[PDB]
Design a binder for this molecule. Sequence first.
Ligand SMILES: OC[C@H]1O[C@@](CO)(O[C@H]2O[C@H](CO)[C@@H](O)[C@H](O)[C@H]2O)[C@@H](O)[C@@H]1O
Ligand SMILES: Cn1nc(-c2cccs2)cc1N
Ligand SMILES: Cn1nc(-c2cccs2)cc1N
Lengths: 141, 143
Amino acid sequence: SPGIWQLDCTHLEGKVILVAVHVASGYIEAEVIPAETGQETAYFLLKLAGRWPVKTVHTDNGSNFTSTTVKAACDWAGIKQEDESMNKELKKIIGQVRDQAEHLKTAVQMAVFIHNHKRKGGIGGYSAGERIVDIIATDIQ
Amino acid sequence: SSPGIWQLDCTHLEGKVILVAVHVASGYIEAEVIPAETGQETAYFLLKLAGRWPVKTVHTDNGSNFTSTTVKAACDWAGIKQEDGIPESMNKELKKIIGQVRDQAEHLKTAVQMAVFIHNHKRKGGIGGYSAGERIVDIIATD
Ligand SMILES: OC[C@H]1O[C@@](CO)(O[C@H]2O[C@H](CO)[C@@H](O)[C@H](O)[C@H]2O)[C@@H](O)[C@@H]1O
Ligand SMILES: Cn1nc(-c2cccs2)cc1N
Ligand SMILES: Cn1nc(-c2cccs2)cc1N
């Protein structure tokens, strides 16, 4: 399960936030896009797969994933498509920083920073970002 | 190199701008096509990068986009030590790979992400070697 991601959309202030969660770590990647289109979905997936070893993405089965451009990007990147706890939290963190920035895009990326750096537990814990890299590094044997 | 050092560099193609972040110790890259080398685009790029990887230090070319106060303010918010004017064939290599995949993409930005994918997955130094993607994770894993 080092290659398993879950992708969802959240609609806010009339734009769309594409959120990808690495299911094993809780690590998040997100973008704000003007609209939930095939072109934007494909691009997002391609960016993700170039940065992390993406095997399988679980989606909501919306029309943006049925696109010939998404199928092509998935074939090219070797991504297989199939088919909240962390997504609900991301919405909460976006509210807590919302006032610190003019644009929603900024607030979103500040929330991704906060989420991925935040140590869970006491001294001896890990962040989501530590967890993804430890998991992947461990798998490289 | 030290694990938290990234080098930012820009490259220009088909009259658009490619912002490139190289993780110095591994050669791992992240890139985005942006409309223009503005303060807000640069800030936003850095904020994204710093949310995705441990970014302690950034070396820049000291372009005007890095002297803007929205960039300096992002780097402060994110705890990034901005090091302007601290020192090339990474742009050469990216452009070459972009040339190989260019005809498989309707739009430049897609060919850029395809080229980033290829660079990061390419095994460097023979069959027992490792890709940039493998090197970065191995270098920064703490446990
Ligand atoms: O809000 C989008 C934001 O991303 C940038 C680069 O940091 O451009 C890319 O962003 C999206 C990636 O999913 C795409 O919508 C866009 O096509 C792409 O170039 C910024 O320029 C932009 O503000
Ligand atoms: C301390 N540390 N932080 C990380 C992150 C990875 C991705 C986001 S943050 C990885 C390690 N080793
Ligand atoms: C083949 N492969 N590629 C990786 C990457 C790690 C980070 C980016 S890509 C990890 C493994 N096992």
